Design a protein around this ligand. Structure first.
Ligand SMILES: [Cl-]
Ligand SMILES: [Cl-]
Ligand SMILES: [Cl-]
Ligand SMILES: [Cl-]
Ligand SMILES: [Cl-]
Ligand SMILES: [Mg+2]
Length: 300
């Protein structure tokens, strides 16, 4: 089969995933995060050990404090960008939506739940009920739930974001994967790819929009897995050449822009599985998309 498939089988046969993953960690970029570590920003960071590099951090367009824990992953060869961010805190939900507005994002991909393992891993940063809209007074934004489509393991929401200064409104699509555990993997390649293709189908990743926002709790593990698989499939798609993609090199390129992307060796292995499976679609087996939808059990 494909070259990534041959490397996959070699690594599985030798039981080498931990060593492969540790090599990536060792080779990964190390750039300063001075702004993230300023005293005044301590309460804007969810995790002490997860910070945006200065070079790639998203700046808020405000004079007071322009800091958010968010990074622009700009994949030059693939011609796709993503914004990866932590799950917003109770005091940074206004900042989060400010960033969405200013960066002209059409979609937000949320890969975590608000409560995981008994702890609050993300703030409730969007409205749960149509009739209870949210106002972010610090950033002068209003957010309303317009509709939601609840599936067995993910939910898609239509939100309306309004800049109260100008009264301009935009439709934001929210893609919420609700069964992906932290430091874990999706139930199957099919369930993951079914969801990724839902995001793709929406047009949220179009170059006509700002970068999609992808987040988890830390904005690196589940978020890294999602973007690695998406970028690798896009690279193969541009060239129509699966054997042209080097998944580990792509991950190291991504890690130039945000630290710590992909948090376990099993998330790396899963990324391979997802790309190998998705290649079937890229190379012209259109019917596999329906198979994923069936295998994902999304209706239940
Ligand atoms: Cl300071
Ligand atoms: Cl949730
Ligand atoms: Cl829980
Ligand atoms: Cl929180
Ligand atoms: Cl790491
Ligand atoms: Mg995470």
């Amino acid at each position: 089969g494909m070259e990534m498939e041959k490397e996959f089988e070699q690594i599985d046969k030798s039981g080498s995933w931990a060593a492969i993953y540790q090599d990536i960690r060792h080779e990964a970029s190390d750039f300063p995060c001075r702004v993230a570590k300023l005293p005044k920003n301590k309460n804007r960071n969810r995790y002490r050990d997860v910070s945006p590099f200065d070079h790639s951090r998203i700046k808020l367009h405000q004079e007071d404090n322009d800091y958010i824990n968010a990074s622009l992953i700009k994949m030059e060869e693939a011609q796709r960008s993503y914004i990866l961010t932590q799950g917003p805190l109770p005091n940074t939900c206004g900042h989060f939506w400010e960033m969405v507005w200013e960066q002209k994002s059409r979609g937000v991909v949320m890969l975590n739940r608000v409560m995981e393992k008994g702890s609050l891993k993300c703030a409730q940063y969007w409205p749960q009920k149509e009739e209870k809209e949210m106002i972010f007074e610090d950033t002068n934004l209003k957010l309303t739930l317009i509709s939601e489509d609840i599936k067995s393991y993910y939910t898609v929401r239509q939100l309306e974001l309004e800049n109260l200064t100008t009264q301009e409104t935009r439709e934001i699509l929210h893609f919420h994967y609700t069964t992906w555990p932290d430091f874990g993997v999706p139930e199957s390649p099919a369930s993951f790819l079914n969801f990724l293709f839902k995001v793709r189908e929406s047009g949220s990743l179009s170059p006509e929009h700002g970068p999609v926002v992808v987040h988890s709790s830390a904005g690196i593990g589940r978020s890294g897995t999602f973007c690695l698989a998406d970028t690798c499939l896009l690279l193969m798609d541009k060239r129509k050449d699966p054997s042209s993609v080097d998944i580990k090199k792509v991950l190291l390129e991504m890690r130039k822009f945000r630290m710590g992307l992909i948090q376990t060796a099993d998330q790396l292995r899963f990324s391979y599985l997802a790309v190998i499976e998705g290649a079937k679609f890229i190379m012209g087996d259109s019917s596999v998309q329906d198979q994923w939808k069936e295998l994902s059990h999304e209706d239940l």
